[PDB]
Write a protein that binds this ligand. Sequence first.
Ligand code: 5FU
Ligand code: 5FU
Ligand code: CL
Ligand code: CL
Lengths: 213, 213
Amino acid sequence: VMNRLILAMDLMNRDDALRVTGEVREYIDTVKIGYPLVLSEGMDIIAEFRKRFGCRIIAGFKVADIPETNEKICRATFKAGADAIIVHGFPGADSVRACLNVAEEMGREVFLLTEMSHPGAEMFIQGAADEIARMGVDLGVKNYVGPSTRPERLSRLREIIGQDSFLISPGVGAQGGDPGETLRFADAIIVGRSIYLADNPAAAAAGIIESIK
Amino acid sequence: VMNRLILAMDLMNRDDALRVTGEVREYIDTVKIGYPLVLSEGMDIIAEFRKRFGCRIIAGFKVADIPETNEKICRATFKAGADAIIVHGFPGADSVRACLNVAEEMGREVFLLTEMSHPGAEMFIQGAADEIARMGVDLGVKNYVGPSTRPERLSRLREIIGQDSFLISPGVGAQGGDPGETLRFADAIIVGRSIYLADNPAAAAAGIIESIK
Ligand SMILES: O=c1[nH]c(=O)n([C@@H]2O[C@H](COP(=O)(O)O)[C@@H](O)[C@H]2O)cc1F
Ligand SMILES: O=c1[nH]c(=O)n([C@@H]2O[C@H](COP(=O)(O)O)[C@@H](O)[C@H]2O)cc1F
Ligand SMILES: [Cl-]
Ligand SMILES: [Cl-]
């Protein structure tokens, strides 16, 4: 990923989303698009980003349904042009495998979300996170998502998945995570509000990159 | 809910989804629409269902993001016309409260998903389900979702939420759940494939209703 920086584009109207992404297009080649934008503007927005910016698109949908429905969601998402999709690991192995099947069939990628970055993640997710990570490793998952807000947890996740696995991490900036510290373990950081809500998105992105040069 | 029957409309194209729902419109007044249909046809499909069938719409999105993003998803979903939204409880209390805030503001409902119906749910969700249910009760949540595939678990969920709470349950039909048995604890059953994939959807719906007269 260019500059180890993935833009989380969660603005909810096409004009703003496209304008801000355009402002920082020179600093990134990977954008994470989620439900805030997709539900507001439609899935066609994914193709718009790919054509306008030539960027990789990660659908941050965090699929968490039964196997059959997960397959349908992945199919629809990849048909829309997404290069990868984020999947929740908490629902179990069968739900993850359903996504892996579609990804292999269509030549796309699955990112396994192991532990989340918000406070509430401590209640139920954290206690299952290490096992979720091991589940991914046992199934051959190569891409993971871990929390920037809990450095020691992110470090443990890295130990479980190994050096060869790709790890991205949200929670940088607005949620309190530090770019440099997070990159001690993750290969790339996900940054949303710190950039898209900044008075000068380009300056914000450049500042983050400067701090991790 | 009419006939204690909620149609899970997971077909992925407008014509088929509307045609099948029309075939069974006399048997239901509540439809659960999820990502398979919404991502394929756009969120405007919710308003289409409401105007064509005059039915209640439950968005089976099972929101499972951080508080800030959950708020955005709920806002977009309710703006689209959904009467209620299903929210995953595993991400914690703050993520649930974010949804409750928007629902209260817009005069809509939140359904808390405790335990899931598929096999993989046993890995991590099941062990946290009773506590997730208690979390909902402590926050004043009145609508819940529990598994038809595990009758004793559904029974335990009912005991935790009390007789006053509203409980709906998926996993009936295709996943093996029995309509009558499930209704010993749930107030309404969610049925998808057993109806929408049937040779005669109307006959399938009528048959289910007949078995629970
Ligand atoms: O654990 C997680 N934490 C997150 O913050 N996210 C997403 O990353 C993004 C974080 O953006 P921020 O604005 O930089 O906080 C946003 O899209 C979230 O929904 C997902 C996760 F899986
Ligand atoms: O635990 C769950 N099990 C489910 O099956 N579902 C949804 O209910 C529906 C079940 O449909 P079926 O075709 O009757 O199995 C479908 O939309 C699922 O995504 C959600 C859940 F939260
Ligand atoms: Cl995400
Ligand atoms: Cl659902």
